[PDB]
Amino acid sequence: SSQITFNTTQQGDMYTIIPEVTLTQSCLCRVQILSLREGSSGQSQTKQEKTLSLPANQPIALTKLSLNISPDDRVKIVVTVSDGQSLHLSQQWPP
């Protein structure tokens, strides 16, 4: 399987999110990570794009997000990996 998965842990309301990608096919690809955090205080929105040469059958850590998530907050993280051709993966956190 080629897939995006999320390594996630928590210490109190402190959350660490590490998106990971494994490819069945060695390639060059475009990786986009979007994150959105909304609370009563305010909002944080990140958009990050990188072009990456990636080997197959190896998990790759795509970035590391440290978020502070209270019970009232919303978080959404969308990770996409594509070559504009036959590779297109997309996954959202939380599941």
Residue numbers in the entry: 3 to 97
Provide passages from the article that reported this PDB entry.
In this study, we report the crystal structure of CsgC, the first among the Csg proteins to be solved. The protein adopts an immunoglobulin-like fold and contains an unusual invariant CxC motif reminiscent of the oxido-reductase superfamily CxxC motif. Based on its similarity to the N-terminal domain of DsbD, we propose that CsgC has redox activity and CsgG is the potential substrate.
We obtained structures of CsgC in which the cysteines were either oxidized or reduced. The reduced protein had a molecular weight of 12,066 Da, however after incubation with oxidized glutathione (GSSG) this decreased by 2 Da, indicating formation of the disulfide. Strikingly, the introduction of the disulfide bond caused a large increase in protein stability, as evidenced by a shift in the thermal melting midpoint Tm value from 66.1 ± 0.5°C to 92.4 ± 0.8°C. A unique feature of the CsgC structure is the invariant CxC motif that connects the BC loop to strand C. Similarly, the CxC motif of CsgC is partially buried and the intervening side chain is always an exposed, nonpolar residue (L/V).
